[PDB]
Design a protein around this ligand. Structure first.
Ligand SMILES: Nc1ncnc2c1ncn2[C@@H]1O[C@H](COP(=O)(O)OP(=O)(O)O)[C@@H](O)[C@H]1O
Ligand SMILES: Nc1ncnc2c1ncn2[C@@H]1O[C@H](COP(=O)(O)OP(=O)(O)O)[C@@H](O)[C@H]1O
Ligand SMILES: [Mg+2]
Ligand SMILES: [Mg+2]
Lengths: 168, 372, 317, 399, 187
């Protein structure tokens, strides 16, 4: 969790809080319309350069910013394939309820497992000095959950094995 | 690698930290407790299970179960929960980035060792791990190389004589009387004065009573005769309920169970006779040195005046021509940890790990043929 | 449910309904079971006559093992010549059933329990051989090892009921050891089955359940006695769980339950892997809810006026 | 090579009808309800169907996963499927092909979730999703030997949770004409329970209302004339024997409900204000919105479906109302123009498989060799992701 | 029983009604062979309902409370105790003994005390101890019909023995040993 992820976590925090200087901006190709500019990528003069934060080859933090919208996709550790399946299913459930989260994408960008997307409106109404707090909190708690759920798998396997075998 | 993990997963208490440090970063009771009521409240963050210090603090509405019984883990689910707690909630370091050192009592079933190694390698994916005996750790901590070690803890008491750099596995004596049995006997003999302790919370309270009041006398008959004129021996304790209880001859009676195991109805030698037999089982040429080096270790050996009485009994048993000396450092409560850290911070120890690449190519039986 | 059922529930319910009924009706339904076994129910000749058929890929090996006689003395005179496309057939007419209700119920249960009833022939044969060797060894203790070896050689029996499964069973003077050649395709199934099998081994070890038969599992290598047996690949991806059934585990009062249990083992393991998947689903959603709780910060307090129920404030003030 | 027989699932609002392809009847027709608590872990202590119904006061709390045809809670649905498959149906998922059915007008999200549950929790060989109707058209024709398929008509599928009026012309389903009323057997069951409530009968359990429908209710021409007939005729006053749990011979005196309940279909104002168009008028609108050339085929063949269309005189009243409305329109056109016409006839058709027409149509369809090619293979799912079945096809055009 | 009688609608507060409830428990309460099945059967309250006549002449009816309160012995959590049932405590006490003395402990269980007179308590205890204990051997329960006064019968038998007279605590010993003679004389 922490006491363990200081430099990576603080680098992500600083980069995210620096990249969240959004602004209301309409569409330069369609009139009377405004769209998240990071997702469309049609006007390159307002798209800041993509930025990547990493701690190890299996952990990355792609930070793509724009004038109004910021997309922030991360990779979390999957040491063994058990954690691979657990991470995939858990993060699918996480993104399946993006309606009540307001900063999630229903489908992550390829080569990743989750992609946040903070449009202007979220910074407009929701005070954003704890969106990053939620970000880092999730980035550590997710590994916590994966470990706990694999423990629960082992426990249930033990219980069912005992229940089956005792009734000879 | 900068530092290596090390965890003393003892039966009653668990000690964890980094190799080379001189202070336990994390010590919490090895307790996993589940609620036993309804919770008509709303919210409150209903947590399914509380482990460690949280369970010790909220024992009012919880039932506590020790995963390790008599040094053998019996609830692997609770053991995994405790290891997860140590890794994430208190030390909060990723297991996959730190080799770990574990401790297991001698003469335990091989199933315990194999299962522990497999769990650490697969469920936690540690880089490397090692399993060591308590007596070797005690010798490492004390700075000695020769001397029989008495390791009395919460779960089991064992003796492992070790000459200069060599251990005699055939002279290892293991006794299943320990702090938990002493606490149970104290609970049983506190009933004769009226006070009754039943639930696990009462068991922890009695453990605190034994912590703060129990001590070992010098001569049992003389101490009982003195207690007959019960004038200047009784003490008082304050329960959390606020009621004050008085303690008497049972203040020192229950520590004597170590020296007279017949008190709890078990036919075995005391912690002095077992040491004498363990020394006599060794070669004759090394007894003259093992007598001079008696090592006290573990939490149970923290009773006041236990060392003096044990020295008296061993001197009585042994011939008078050769002197008997017993040693007990004031920090012997964490002697096992100190030895473990000293061993883990040794350059010559770097090639004695068990790496994952070594483990997966030989199965979980590799621990038997490498660790010990 | 924790334990899988031991017979086909549909057959049991259908038989009970048609026996307790007064006006029978023509039926033609083919029903599949676990492990590829298929059952067919039809009434071709008379409305009161019901024919039930059994399908199994390994049935000729059962015939080789001597299952026709066991089926005969199990099902009495009910035996009928097999139908096309099926292995074992039975024809029942409602006009000859015993009047007593308990006889009808036990007949329905026995017919519905046809799967293990036909699959238990090797187990019965192994038990008889075990009794023979037990009495022969009791005749002279000094004559044990050579007869034990010759029984391990000659009486070594095997069967292939799935293309990734195998039972290898052989008797002795005191025990009837059985080997399962488990293997799971559908990668995630094998992924969870690794943990399931590892935990299943440990179980026996625990002193809590020492009364159970001894288990022995070691992947990437088969036991000594079955490397030369045909059909056993040289540890490609197949595990090998071995149960050692001692004399106490098949006492004359516990043979049938042990047979059914050891038969249903693999299906229980599969179903419980699926149940573990569901357990993940529910826990994972249950506390991604907690993550949503953690997120629900960063929302300044707002007030909704009424939003009473199934409507919009139901009033102008 | 020779595949195993396909499995015909069916998850209705009130009843779920499992079974196999080629069978002459569903193997199981049991309510779509799961019992659940709130030393077996709480993960597995669940019962479904009749077992759940009997084990209701023993420590379980029933819950219906499906309402109005759309699934709300997913734990209940997945547990229902696993219990069915591994307890009653007794099949291994990896060696069979499934034919799921679900009502139209569902969100694509529900279909995506169903597909991902089926191909991840179970991962069967193949999954095919069909629209509750269609199968109704397939099962409409009885002597389906080689040629006598109508292939053009209207299916009025009225069930427990929601009713659907779907026209079909030469096989293809015209999406733009699809319309759905959110009233069905459950709403009129609640109405019957309320009618028992107002009369203060000794027993008013919902199962009592269901049985009161089962052996009491019938459709009537009009409400005021039926009320007058009930006042005059005294033998239409029945007393149904309840025997709920211990109330032996507690007869329930039924009344005007017997004709007041079925009238909701032809007068939907009674149920609620969410809908106000009577069923024959709505069917007329559906047929008129259809292309001109297929109106004769739509009117000629009307197929009833579901268990809620088994009311006596339901088809007669529906046919009478539709025929009257179409005659009114045709005559209006005639006096507007001044010429006679041959007119159009209406034949509302009921058959011997009314209750489970959807299941029977699915079973008849699955036996066709070409059905296998239409299924979603597991390789396609693992390649194109979990959103392979989200493009909704029958109603409306994508993009 | 007093606590659970309130939910039915009957209130019994002070000592007189406490003795009344005790008399009710004498004649109505019994121990079911199994708990969950009997609780399920209580829904079809046909053979379970019973009527009792209070001293005031008011008749009361009782249902599942007949076997709900005697079950507290096997489930001490009902009254809020973190202890084990009688069968579990007996099994633990047997297990704590020596290895070779469990033959007679399993084969000889003495059922003594007034509370052990419930209808069907012996059968339930036998079934539970059979379930916990290994199935290799047999479990026997000895329940004499006069077990209510078994303690007194045994006391009379012991006092009538011709070897017990030497073990009496005479007043002569007490006149010099104080009141502590009983500690080291009796047991
Ligand atoms: N000062 C003390 N006086 C008496 N008993 C003690 C004292 N300190 C610890 N103990 C007993 O010793 C036990 C500590 O066990 P511990 O030595 O941690 O076991 P392990 O060696 O297996 O980790 C406690 O349960 C406690 O009852
Ligand atoms: N004989 C009947 N007459 C009228 N309504 C019925 C009759 N039998 C059942 N119903 C009701 O009609 C519903 C439709 O049955 P079915 O098609 O199986 O349900 P679903 O629409 O949930 O798939 C039943 O669930 C029930 O509420
Ligand atoms: Mg220790
Ligand atoms: Mg329906």
């Amino acid at each position: 969790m922490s006491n363990t992820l200081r430099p990576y976590l603080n680098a992500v925090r600083s980069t995210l809080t620096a990249s969240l200087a959004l602004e209301e901006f309409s569409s330069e190709i369609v009139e009377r319309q405004s769209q998240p500019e990071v997702e469309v990528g049609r006007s390159p003069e307002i798209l800041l350069k993509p930025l990547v934060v990493s701690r190890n080859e299996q952990e990355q933090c792609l930070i793509e910013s724009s004038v109004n919208s910021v997309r922030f996709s991360i990779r979390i550790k999957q040491v063994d394939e058990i954690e691979r399946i657990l991470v995939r299913k858990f993060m699918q459930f996480l993104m399946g309820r993006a309606e009540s989260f307001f900063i999630l994408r229903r489908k992550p960008v390829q080569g990743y497992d989750i992609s946040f997307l903070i449009t202007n409106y979220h910074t407009e109404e929701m005070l954003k000095h704890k969106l990053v707090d939620f970000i880092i909190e999730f980035m550590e708690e997710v590994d916590a959950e994966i470990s706990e759920m694999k423990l629960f798998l082992n426990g249930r396997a033990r219980l069912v094995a005992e229940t089956y075998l005792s009734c000879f | 690698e900068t530092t290596a993990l090390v965890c003393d997963n003892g039966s009653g208490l668990v000690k964890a930290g980094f190799a080379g440090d001189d202070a336990p970063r994390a010590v919490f009771p090895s307790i996993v407790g589940r609620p036993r009521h309804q919770g008509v409240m709303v919210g409150m963050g209903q947590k399914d299970s509380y482990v460690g210090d949280e369970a010790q603090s909220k024992r009012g509405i919880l039932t506590l179960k020790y995963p390790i019984e008599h040094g053998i883990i019996t609830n692997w689910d609770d053991m995994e929960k405790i290891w997860h707690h140590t890794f994430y909630n208190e030390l909060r370091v990723a297991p996959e980035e730190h080799p770990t050192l574990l401790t297991e009592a001698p003469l335990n079933p091989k199933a315990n060792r194999e299962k522990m190694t497999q769990i650490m390698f697969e469920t936690f994916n540690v880089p490397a791990m090692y399993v060591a005996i308590q007596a070797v750790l005690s010798l490492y901590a004390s700075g000695r190389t020769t001397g029989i070690v008495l390791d009395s803890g919460d779960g089991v008491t064992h003796n492992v004589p070790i000459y200069e750099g060599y251990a005699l596995p055939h002279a290892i004596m293991r006794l299943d009387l320990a702090g938990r049995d002493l606490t149970d006997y104290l609970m049983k003999i506190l009933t004769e004065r009226g006070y009754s302790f039943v639930t696990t919370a009462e068991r922890e309270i009695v453990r605190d009573i034994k912590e703060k009041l129990c001590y070992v006398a010098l001569d049992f008959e003389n101490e009982m005769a003195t207690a007959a004129s019960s004038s200047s021996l009784e003490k008082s304790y304050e329960l959390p309920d606020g009621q004050v209880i008085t303690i008497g001859n049972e203040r020192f009676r229950c520590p004597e169970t170590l020296f007279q195991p017949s008190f709890i109805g078990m036919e075995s030698a005391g912690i002095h006779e077992t040491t004498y037999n363990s020394i006599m089982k060794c070669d004759i040429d090394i007894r003259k040195d093992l007598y001079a080096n008696n090592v006290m270790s573990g939490g149970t050996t923290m009773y006041p005046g236990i060392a003096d009485r044990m020295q008296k009994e061993i001197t009585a048993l042994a011939p008078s021509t050769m002197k008997i000396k017993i040693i007990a450092p004031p920090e012997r409560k964490y002697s096992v940890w100190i030895g473990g850290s000293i061993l883990a911070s040794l350059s010559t120890f770097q090639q004695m790990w068990i790496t994952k690449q070594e483990y997966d190519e030989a199965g979980p039986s590799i621990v038997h043929r490498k660790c010990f | 449910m924790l334990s899988l059922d031991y017979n086909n529930i549909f057959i049991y319910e259908l038989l009970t309904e048609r026996f307790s009924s007064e006006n029978p009706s023509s039926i033609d339904q083919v029903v599949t079971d676990f492990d590829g076994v298929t059952f067919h129910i039809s009434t071709p000749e008379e409305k009161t006559k019901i024919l039930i058929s059994l399908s199994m890929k390994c049935y000729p090996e059962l015939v080789n093992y001597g299952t026709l006689d066991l089926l005969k003395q199990i099902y009495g005179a009910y035996v009928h010549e097999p139908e096309m496309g099926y292995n074992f057939s039975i024809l029942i007419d409602l006009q000859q059933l015993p009047a007593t209700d308990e006889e009808k119920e036990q007949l329905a249960m026995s017919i519905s329990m046809l799967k293990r009833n036909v699959l238990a022939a090797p187990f019965h044969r192994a038990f008889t051989k075990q009794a023979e060797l037990a009495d022969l060894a009791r005749k002279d203790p000094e004559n044990a090892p050579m007869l034990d070896k010759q029984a391990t050689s000659q009486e070594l029996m095997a069967i292939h009921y799935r293309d990734e499964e195998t039972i290898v069973l052989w008797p002795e003077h005191d025990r009837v050891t059985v080997v399962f050649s488990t293997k799971f395709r559908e990668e995630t199934d094998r992924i969870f089955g690794k943990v399931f099998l590892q935990e299943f081994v440990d179980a026996r070890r625990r002193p809590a359940i020492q009364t159970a038969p001894q288990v022995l599992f070691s992947y990437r290598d088969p036991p000594l006695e079955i490397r030369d047996i045909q059909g056993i690949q040289k540890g490609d991806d197949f595990g090998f769980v071995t149960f050692v059934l001692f004399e106490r585990h098949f006492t004359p009062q516990n043979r049938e339950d042990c047979i059914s249990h050891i038969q249903v083992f693999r299906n229980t393991l599969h179903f419980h892997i699926k149940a573990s998947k569901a357990y993940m689903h529910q826990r994972m959603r249950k506390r991604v809810a907690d993550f949503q709780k953690v997120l629900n910060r960063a929302k300044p307090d707002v007030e909704l006026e009424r939003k009473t129920a199934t409507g919009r404030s139901f009033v102008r003030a | 090579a020779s595949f195993n027989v396909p499995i015909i699932m069916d998850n209705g609002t009130g009843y779920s009808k499992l079974g196999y392809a080629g069978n002459d009847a569903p193997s199981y027709v049991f309510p779509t309800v799961i019992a659940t608590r709130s030393r077996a872990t709480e993960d597995l202590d669940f019962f479904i169907g009749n077992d759940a119904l009997k084990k209701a006061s023993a420590g379980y709390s029933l819950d219906y996963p499906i309402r109005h045809g759309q699934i709300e809670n997913w734990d209940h649905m997945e547990r229902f499927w696993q219990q069915s498959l591994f307890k009653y149906l007794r099949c291994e998922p990896e060696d069979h092909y499934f034919l799921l059915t679900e009502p139209p007008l569902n969100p694509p999200e529900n279909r995506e979730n169903t597909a991902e549950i089926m191909f991840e929790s179970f991962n069967c060989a193949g999954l095919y999703i069909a629209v509750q109707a269609v199968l109704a058209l397939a099962a409409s024709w009885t002597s389906s030997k080689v040629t006598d398929r109508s292939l053009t008509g209207t299916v009025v599928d009225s069930g427990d949770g929601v009713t659907h009026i779907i026209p079909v012309a030469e096989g293809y389903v015209i999406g733009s004409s699809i319309k759905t009323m959110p009233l069905a057997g459950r709403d009129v069951t609640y109405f019957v329970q309320s009618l028992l409530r107002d009369r203060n009968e000794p027993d008013s359990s919902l199962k009592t209302a269901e049985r009161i429908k089962e052996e009491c209710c019938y459709v009537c021409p009009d409400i005021v004339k039926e009320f007058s007939r009930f006042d005059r005729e005294p033998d239409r006053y029945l007393k149904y024997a309840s025997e709920s749990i211990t109330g032996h011979s507690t007869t329930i005196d039924v009344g005007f409900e017997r004709f007041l309940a079925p009238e909701i279909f032809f007068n939907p104002e009674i149920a609620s204000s969410d809908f106000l168009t009577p069923l024959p008028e709505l069917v007329d609108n559906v047929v008129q919105s259809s292309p001109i050339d297929v109106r004769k085929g739509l009117y000629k063949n009307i197929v009833l479906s579901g268990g809620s269309t088994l009311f006596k005189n339901f088809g007669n009243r529906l046919q009478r109302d539709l025929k009257r409305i179409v005659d009114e329109r045709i005559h209006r056109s005639e006096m507007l123009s001044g010429a006679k016409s041959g007119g159009v006839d209406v034949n509302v058709i009921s058959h011997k498989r009314q209750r489970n027409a959807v299941w029977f149509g699915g079973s008849l369809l699955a036996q066709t060799p070409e059905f296998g090619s239409y299924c979603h293979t597991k390789a396609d799912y693992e390649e194109y992701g979990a959103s392979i079945a989200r493009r909704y096809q029958i109603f409306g055009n994508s993009l």
